[model samples]
Target: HWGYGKHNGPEHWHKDFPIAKGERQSPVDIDTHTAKYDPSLKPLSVSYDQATSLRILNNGHAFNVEFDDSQDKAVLKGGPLDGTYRLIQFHFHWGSLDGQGSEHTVDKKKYAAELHLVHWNTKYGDFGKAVQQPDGLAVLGIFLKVGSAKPGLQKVVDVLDSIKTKGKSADFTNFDPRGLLPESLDYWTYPGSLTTPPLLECVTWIVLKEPISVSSEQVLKFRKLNFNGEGEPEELMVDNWRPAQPLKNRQIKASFK
Candidate 1:
């Protein structure tokens, strides 16, 4: 891939990451939820068998990852986390070096980008079989806001130097994906679906009301990823977010004070 700039970065996201374009995606603004949300719901805790062969890729726009099923497994357990599921894949969303980077929307406003940790219920047996299940998907929405003053995300940023080029991937071992979550695990839980196309309505969403922090410099590096067919410029997707969709009759539930 040559270079990826705004308007062209996401073009190749699907090929590299595999699950880019979807109907029920995330990075929702979350500013205008119905004041009457359910107070009975509680934050669910996800449990998964330890995963291995965790690989990282600097796809230009942001970081993407994969968990080899041959050696790893995970289970989401807690509130709505009681169900059994296997970790399938995880990827990120970001901005063009500026603004808020996220994938899910809020109040119809798209953020800089959003990270979706895609998982499939084991009910159907496997990811390939589970992702298609109407009630077989779970996604963790991680919000990325604007900031670059040596943020805590150093866990991922520190390793960027090794695979800092487009189309580059680094070999990671014995790493726990949960380590990347913000220190504050208190989250906003809800019964939702995948944020992308083929959106399966089988997810019990737990969106952390507590937003995470990342350095502005990290955002700059993310903005540089290539995002076009054959990795061309102009196709760079500076902002890879979809405005928050209507909840319709669905209620965005949560648990906490």
Candidate 2:
């Protein structure tokens, strides 16, 4: 299947998934000078319930903390969305080193890591069906800078050892995702696709301008994960982020001036 190694990396994805070359692909470079300030855009509204957290898994591509999306207990509204979008899951993308990891960049500047909070439009029934529509998905992107330790993030880091190999998962509950957000919700919105394979072009990306902090030591814990399963040859799960895609004819809107 598709992977981040030399034989089947992002550069080679188009061979199997032609849509990788399609217009409006995700993880685009955010040029501050070109992103227009939209006064009409409303501030994003996110309400996440701790009880909605289900489990965490290493899916080979990246480790994702899945959620119970059967209800509207955790949802996202406003900020270019027509209605409520249920939070499905949240995951992180990081690099082998501290210099680069985030999928989306600001003015060509890369961050230590990036967090993706995947949500689906309630109007589209469920995530499976939602993935087929143009306005079905809404992903909140947050940059993670290397600095002080965030107690909220530590809750996640603590469980990495339990799922060190691909396909491994464990119970992950009572975790409040709100604690991971930055102080400001100021963001840039654009039409894009999922950063991973399937690369569905149905996401309305809301990338926050401000970033949360993570200590250098905490980042090392994430690097300990392996992309391969227990028996396979060990491969570190690093640089699990796709490079920035082309903007094409798309326009990016900022919530701040």
The C-alpha stretches of model 2 lying farther than 4 A from their native spots are none
What lDDT would candidate 1 get against the real structure? 0.57
Per-candidate clashes come to 53, 0
Model 2 agreement with the true structure over 107-179: per-residue lDDT tens digits? 9999999999999999988999998888999999999999999889998999999999999999998889998
Model 1, range 181-205, lDDT digits (tens) per residue?
6666555655555544334455666
Model 1 stretches astray by more than 4 angstroms: 1-40, 46-49, 58-62, 70-73, 105-112, 148-152, 158-168, 198-202, 229-237
Candidate no. 1 TM-score: 0.72
Model number with the top lDDT: 2
| TM-score (all chains, Cα) for each model | 0.72, 0.99
Worst 10 residues of 2 by lDDT: 45-54
The lowest-lDDT stretch of 10 consecutive residues in candidate 1 is 1-10
